[PDB]
Design a binder for this molecule. Structure first.
Ligand SMILES: *[C@@H]1O[C@H](CO)[C@@H](O[C@@H]2O[C@H](CO)[C@@H](O[C@@H]3O[C@H](CO)[C@@H](O)[C@H](O)[C@@H]3O)[C@H](O)[C@H]2NC(C)=O)[C@H](O)[C@H]1NC(C)=O
Lengths: 173, 45, 325
């Protein structure tokens, strides 16, 4: 990991959220399941395809390149010709191979940043309300419906509303 | 107009759609930026 | 209590990229940037078929070697094709001067209108036009000669000084070809051109040369001790080319008015030609791909993916992926 949030303190993902790149498993009175985040997912896509778009946009297509003929007294310029051809290939093979190794690692921990980034957008929306057991988990002191729970995912809230519900739960155990 | 990169936002979003289609199906189209739910529609074959 | 967790995607995808720290890394989503696939066929570009030289090469084509007679009607092409099977040559031994440059020239040529520059019948009242065949170019069991050049000879006992000019009214470049003949022996000079010492002179606004025959005993190629040199020039619009000889001149007969265009060339391959159309062509076959790279062939005609030496080019898009026990 890099940002630490994949293969991470969260050591696995979830097969059962098919809806996008990131999202929230939530459990309560009513019931449990996955809902994707359509915000940071559409952010990461449009950003990543734009990475894929950018390298290829830096590729003019090949235009016509065909071999050259030389007679038996033109050996030197023929070898010169070979040398230019090999040379340019060695470079473009390098640039293509290396870049893909490089940018893959930079893509992997791009996602690793985006899980970490969403986790704290919640923790910072929570504060007093819950505890961190780790592995993505925020356990609610105060009670929550789906709606209240769709509200963290919404980001919309108001914080003190569930505060008094939560605060005296912290004590006797 | 259809590009290699747009056939990048597309197929990831078709990993997000189902064989018994579990959606109003624009769940592909919000991820395409760009070209419409219209322009997305025919493009599945 | 009530728990909400946060987490990421996972799939059954066995797709695997490489990264700098780690290899064999399995991801939810991939792209392949490298094209391994062609159709194995030589196809059209822009509605237009390539010209298949078949058993002939460019010299055979242009001089009109008697084996190449299938090519005579060819006018336009998208690009030129030779095979591993083209020997069909200059069938009379000798040098073709600046051959590679002529080929290099032909690669900017889209089409030509062939035409008779010095008509066989009209042009040469004082010389023999019918005795101009040799066993070194043999068609249908018989001695013969190039289609596009005429081998002049003495008429009776006489080979009078000849002078012939052609003014280019085509409004485009005209490719004029010709040859000079060097016999093995003075008997052969005398039997052919009747004049013991002789010259061919050729000039234009670009071209100035006086050739004198070199008579020598030589090793025998296709049974000939003699040699024949072939020459060419591009006669510019409006220009005149004038030939003069006392003997030894293999005169132009047919010539070519050229049309230029870019994005063509001359490829070598044994692939079959088909009715397919493509934006990109290699000697191995044609490519239809939106991919940026190709491992197929270095040589390309048209708009193509870039070539590399890579077996594998694969780029991560999604997250990596958990097997989840
Ligand atoms: C058009 O192209 C073909 C080349 O593929 C020419 O055919 C070849 O012509 C030469 C004639 O000398 C043959 O070589 C000879 O072989 C015999 C023994 O077989 C040897 O005694 C001679 O010294 C010489 O090496 C060759 O075998 C023959 N091959 C084929 C495929 O028939 C043909 O002459 C060309 N035609 C013209 C007008 O240029």
């Amino acid at each position: 990991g890099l940002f630490g949030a994949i293969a991470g303190f969260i050591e696995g993902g979830w097969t059962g959220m098919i809806d996008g790149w990131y999202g929230y498993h939530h459990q309560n009175e009513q019931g449990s399941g996955y809902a994707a985040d359509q915000k940071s997912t559409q952010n990461a896509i449009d950003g990543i395809t734009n990475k894929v778009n950018s390298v290829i946009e830096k590729m003019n297509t090949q235009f016509t390149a065909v071999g050259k003929e030389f007679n038996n007294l033109e050996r030197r310029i023929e070898n010169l010709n070979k040398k230019v051809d090999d040379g340019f290939l060695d470079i473009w093979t390098y640039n293509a191979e290396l870049l893909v190794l490089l940018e893959n690692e930079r893509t992997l921990d791009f996602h690793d940043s985006n899980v970490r980034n969403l986790y704290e957008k919640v923790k910072s929306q929570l504060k007093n309300n819950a505890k961190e057991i780790g592995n993505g988990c925020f356990e609610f002191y105060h009670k929550c419906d789906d709606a209240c729970m769709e509200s963290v995912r919404n980001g919309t809230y108001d914080y003190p509303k569930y505060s008094e519900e939560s605060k005296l739960n912290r004590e006797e155990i | 107009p259809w590009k290699f990169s747009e056939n990048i936002a597309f197929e990831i979003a078709l990993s997000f759609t189902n064989k018994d289609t579990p959606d109003r199906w624009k769940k592909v189209a919000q991820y395409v930026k760009g070209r419409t739910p219209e322009e997305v529609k025919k493009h599945y074959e | 209590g009530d728990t909400i967790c946060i987490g990421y995607h996972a799939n059954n995808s066995t797709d695997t990229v490489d990264t700098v720290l780690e290899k064999n890394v399995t991801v939810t989503h991939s792209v392949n940037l490298l094209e391994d696939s062609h159709n194995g066929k030589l196809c059209k570009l822009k509605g237009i078929a390539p010209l298949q030289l078949g058993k002939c090469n460019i010299a055979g084509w242009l001089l009109g070697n008697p084996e190449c007679d299938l090519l005579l009607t060819a006018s336009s092409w998208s690009y030129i094709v030779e095979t591993s099977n083209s020997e069909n040559g200059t069938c009379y031994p000798g040098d073709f001067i600046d051959y590679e440059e002529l080929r290099e020239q032909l690669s900017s040529v889209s089409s030509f209108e062939k035409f008779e520059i010095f008509p066989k019948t009209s042009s040469w009242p004082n010389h023999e036009t019918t005795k101009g065949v040799t066993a070194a170019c043999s068609y249908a069991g018989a001695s013969s000669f190039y289609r596009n050049l005429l081998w002049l000879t003495k008429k009776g006992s006489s080979y009078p000084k000849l002078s012939k000019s052609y003014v280019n009214n085509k409004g485009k470049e005209v490719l004029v070809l010709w040859g000079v003949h060097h016999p093995p022996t003075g008997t052969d000079q005398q039997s052919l051109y009747q004049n013991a010492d002789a010259y061919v002179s050729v000039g234009s606004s670009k071209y100035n040369r006086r050739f004198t025959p070199e008579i020598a005993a030589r090793p025998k190629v296709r049974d000939q001790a003699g040699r024949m040199n072939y020459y060419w020039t591009l006669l510019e619009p409006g220009d005149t080319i004038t030939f003069e000889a006392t003997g030894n001149l293999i005169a132009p007969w047919y010539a070519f008015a050229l049309n230029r265009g870019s994005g063509s060339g001359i490829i070598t391959s044994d692939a079959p030609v088909h009715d397919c159309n493509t934006k990109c062509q290699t000697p191995h076959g044609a490519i239809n791909s939106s991919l940026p790279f190709q491992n197929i062939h270095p040589v390309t005609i048209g708009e193509c993916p870039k070539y590399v030496r890579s077996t594998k080019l694969r780029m991560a898009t999604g997250l990596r992926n958990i097997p989840s026990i």
